[PDB]
Amino acid sequence: MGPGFDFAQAIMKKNTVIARTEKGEFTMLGVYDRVAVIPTHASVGEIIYINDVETRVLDACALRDLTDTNLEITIVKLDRNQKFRDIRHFLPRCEDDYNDAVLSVHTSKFPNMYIPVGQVTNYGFLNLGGTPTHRILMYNFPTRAGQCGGVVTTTGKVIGIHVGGNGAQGFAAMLLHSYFTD
């Protein structure tokens, strides 16, 4: 409807796949080459389904900060025959607050879903499903089951992936450029 949704759509159409693990279907953001991200609670194994194709996982790393605190981001390298468009130049370098963000989801259950979530707070610490978690972004939308892995964007930046909610607020794990240096 506007330039927020325009940027979000451009990311969804070229840089997302549907990932299925034993824990469900997730929006998965492809970042560069065969490297993607997914919430750590997806519990990625040796094999994952990507757009319903059986795919070997070449490497998977559950990120933690240097306080050894969960970040709730898993980086996955996929044995896929095709590279993602490189979107690393759209990743923020530092922890920040944002105005006017969109949360975008693409699954069997929620195809082509775009939610204007508004102001995003650098929340920091969250007890997420009982796990102390750092680098959490917060937005005031009643997000629901099925939105995990959803991509959070502003115009020109990909800032996070949706990892939880409490019925009134939603929470995303930050994406930072430094996670994807190669």
Curated annotation (Swiss-Prot):
Residues 2-180 form the Peptidase C3 domain. Transmembrane segments: none annotated. Signal peptide: none annotated. It catalyses: Selective cleavage of Gln-|-Gly bond in the poliovirus polyprotein. In other picornavirus reactions Glu may be substituted for Gln, and Ser or Thr for Gly. It is found in: Host cytoplasm. The active site is at H41, E72, C148. Major viral protease that mediates proteolytic processing of the polyprotein. Cleaves host EIF5B, contributing to host translation shutoff. Also cleaves host PABPC1, contributing to host translation shutoff. Binds and inhibits host IFIH1/MDA5, thereby inhibiting the type-I IFN production and the establishment of the antiviral state. Cleaves host MAP3K7/TAK1, resulting in inhibition of TRAF6-triggered NF-kappa-B induction. Cleaves host TICAM1; this interaction allows the virus to disrupt host TLR3 signaling. Cleaves host IRF7, resulting in inhibition of type-I IFN production. Interacts with host IFIH1/MDA5; this interaction inhibits host IFIH1. This is Protease 3C.
